[PDB]
Every structure is written in structure tokens, then in C-alpha cells.
Amino acid sequence: EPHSLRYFYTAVSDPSPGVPQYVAVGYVDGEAFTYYDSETRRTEPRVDWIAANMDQQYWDMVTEIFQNTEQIYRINLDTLRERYNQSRGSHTRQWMYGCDLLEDSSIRGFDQHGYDGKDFLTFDKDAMTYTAADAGAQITKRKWEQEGTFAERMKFYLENTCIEWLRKYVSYGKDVLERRERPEVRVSRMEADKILTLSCRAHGFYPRPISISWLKDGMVQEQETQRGSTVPNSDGTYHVWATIDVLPGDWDKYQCRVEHASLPQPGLFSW
């Protein structure tokens, strides 16, 4: 029962292959559901359940918000280049925001801005205030918090409008988002010298959370286990690996343990 709505905006001064001038991607529970960029100038669905529940006026409505924000972010790039006294070139303005709906029905808000790869303004939940990273950011903090109402409008959006959208979205995507797919697990031997490396690979699982560990006669070997980060497949499932080096004559003692929402009991897998 955790749920999230998130928007990621990336605006560059220097478009490049695969990098339009402005891109806005929306995500529900970590899965893309809407996409906009400055080259198409339209918002496209990225999953079937949003295309089936939204009419034309929804797509027109979010599209004109993205087109307008695109326009504002082109001005931001000029403003910030001059403010930091930079030369024309490669520059990136980024915004990530949205809301979480937690187990206990409490909510959380995210609102953070980056410029040229560094923190610019970060909303701090305890201070109820944007943290400026530098004197450049302080100017914008003043514009938003003191010289106008923007900071309060964002607060309202994050705590109300965003949640209302999230509730709608989870109800249209309930089947896709709460599905389960089992990993195909294989333990492989990798090449090494005087040492036997075992590699446990779990393919195609959903949802994302997983525990993959190595046991020796039933005992976790956390100290000796290296594990990669969880990474996506093209179909919305995930992938992870974990390796351990062992004494060749101990081969029979090791099992890979996979605990996952799709598996009634944790699976044990052997070379």
C-alpha cells in the first residue's frame, strides 16, 4: 500500500541526441505514466491504464501546463547563466516534485530544484521552507517566499492537489501496480583464479523490492556478499545479481536465498 506521484523536469540550454530542450516525465509508484518533450509538444501516455481512463481534455490540460513550464524554464536558463556569471554552453535546470501516500494514510511532499548538477533550492519538510544552496539560490527563495505567493501555492499543491491526483491514479492502475511476477533465478559460476565465484541472478520480478542473499549451511554471509543495484527490464520488471567467493571444496554449502512478494516461501537456489 505505498503510493507516489512524481514529476521530473529537465531543461537544457544545449539539446543533444536523446536530450530534447525540455522533458517532463510523470511517474506513479516509480513507473512512467506520462511523457512530454519540447520536440513533440504533446503529452503521451506511457502505460495503458492512463490512456483508458483520461479523455482529451486531460491530455490538453496537462500539455498546456508543460508547454507553459517549458517556456518558463527557457527563461530560467538565461537568468541563471547570467546570475552565476557563466559562459554560454552546457547547462541543465532540473525539478523533481510530487507526493507520497503512506501505509498509515499520512502524506509526504517532495519539491527540489537543481542547476548544473548541484542543489539549487531544496524544500525542507521540518522548516516548511526552501533551503537555498548559495547566494544565487537565495534570490529565488526570496521571490517565491516573500515577494509573492508561489511557495504557499506549491505547499497547497503538494499537500492537496497532488494527493487528489495520486488517489485517482492508483485506482485506474490498481491491476498493473499490484500484479506479481516471479523471478527466474540462475546461479552461475564466473571465471577466477584459485577461487570459486558464484553469481546468483534473479530475472523478471515485480514489484521492485527484493532480498537476495547467500547462505552457507543456512547462515547468511552478508560480509562476503557483493550485490548489484536493482535495475529494470524493458517490460517493467526488474533484475538483480549477488556474488560470493568461496573455497572450491565448499561448493556444496552455498545457496542463494531470494525473498520476494511473488514467492510464497523464500526460494533457495544452488549452482
Binding site: 508543460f66 527563461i75 529565488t140 521571490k143 509573492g148 499543491y157
Partner: peptide
């Protein structure tokens, strides 16, 4: 649905 009325930096 995204936030609207975005203010300039």
C-alpha cells in the same frame, strides 16, 4: 496532474 502557475527563478 502537474503543478501550474510556475514562478520564474
Amino acid at each position: 496532474g502537474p503543478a501550474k502557475g510556475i514562478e520564474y527563478d
